[PDB]
Design a protein around this ligand. Sequence first.
Ligand code: KF3
Ligand code: MG
Ligand code: ZN
Length: 313
Amino acid sequence: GLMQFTLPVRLCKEIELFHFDIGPFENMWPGIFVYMVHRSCGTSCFELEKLCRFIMSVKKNYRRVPYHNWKHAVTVAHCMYAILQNNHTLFTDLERKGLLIACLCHDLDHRGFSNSYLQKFDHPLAALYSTSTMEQHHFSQTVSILQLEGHNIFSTLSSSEYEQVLEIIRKAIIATDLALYFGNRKQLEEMYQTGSLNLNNQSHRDRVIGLMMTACDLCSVTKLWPVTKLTANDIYAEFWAEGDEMKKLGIQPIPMMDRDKKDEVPQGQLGFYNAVAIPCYTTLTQILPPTEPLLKACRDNLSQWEKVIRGEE
Ligand SMILES: CC(C)(C)c1ncc(Nc2cncnc2)c(C(=O)Nc2cccc(OC(F)(F)F)c2)n1
Ligand SMILES: [Mg+2]
Ligand SMILES: [Zn+2]
C-alpha cells in the first residue's frame, strides 16, 4: 500500500508536461506508467502485483515494428495522463482508470499495416471485423489479457462498474480508428459552436473521450521538433513497408506509402497537420482549455515542416 513509484527529479518534473518524451530506456517505461496511474487514479485503483503482471503481458503482445510498438502505447498513455491531470475535476474515477489502460492497450498486436491493407490482402481479421478492423482486434486482445489468470486489474469493481469500464475502453480503442475521427470532430464542432455540448450527456462524453483518444494517439506531432522529426521516420518506415506490400499485390500504393516518392513527405505532413492534427487539437482546446499546449506544440511543428519545404532545413 505504502510503496509509491518515484522517478528521478528531471522526469518527475517533465512527465507533468504534454511534450514529455519517455526516453530510450525500455526498462523504465512500466514504472513510468505505474507512476502516472498512481498520481492520475490513486495507489488503491489497482493491486500492484496484478497491475505489474497486466503491464508486462501487454508489452509482450506489442510487436517489434518501427512505430506501432510498446513505446507508442506508453507515449499515448502519457498524453492521456497529462490531459487528465490538467482536467482534475472533469472525469469520474472509472474514466481515469479505464482511459490510461485503454491508451496502453489501444494498438495491441499491431503488425504495422492499415485496415486498408488488411482488406486488399484479404486478411482473416478483415472477414471477422468489416470496419475498424485492427481496432476491434486491439479491444479483443485487451479482453484476452484481462482474462489471463491473475491479470484482472478490475476484479474489485462491481459487475456494473466492470461492464461500464470495459465499455469506456471499447469505445476509446474503436475511436483511435482515424476514419471515425473526421465525423466525430465535426459533430463536436457543431455542438460546441451551437452551444448544445453537454458533459452530463453520455453520448457527448463518449464523443469527447473519442477526440481525447485521437489527440493522445497523434501526440508525436506535439513533441519538441527533434522528437517529432525522428518519430516521423519510424511512421514512414511502416508506411513504405505497406507501400512495398501493396506493389506485391499488384497495386500502386498512394504517394504517402511510396518510398520512391520520399520528396513528397514534407508536403504530405502539411496536409496531415492542416486536415487532421490542428483541427483535432483546436476542438480539444475549445472543450478542454488547459490542453492548449498540445495545439501550440502542434502549430510550432507545422511551422518546422513549412521551414523544411522552404529549404531552411
Ligand atoms: C497511424 C495514424 C494514427 C494514422 C497516424 N499517426 C501518426 C501520423 N503522423 C506522425 C507525424 N509525425 C510523427 N509521428 C507520427 C500519421 C500520418 O502522418 N498520417 C498521414 C500523413 C499524410 C497524409 C494523411 O492522410 C490523411 F491526412 F487523410 F490522414 C495521413 N498517421
Ligand atoms: Mg491504432
Ligand atoms: Zn496508436
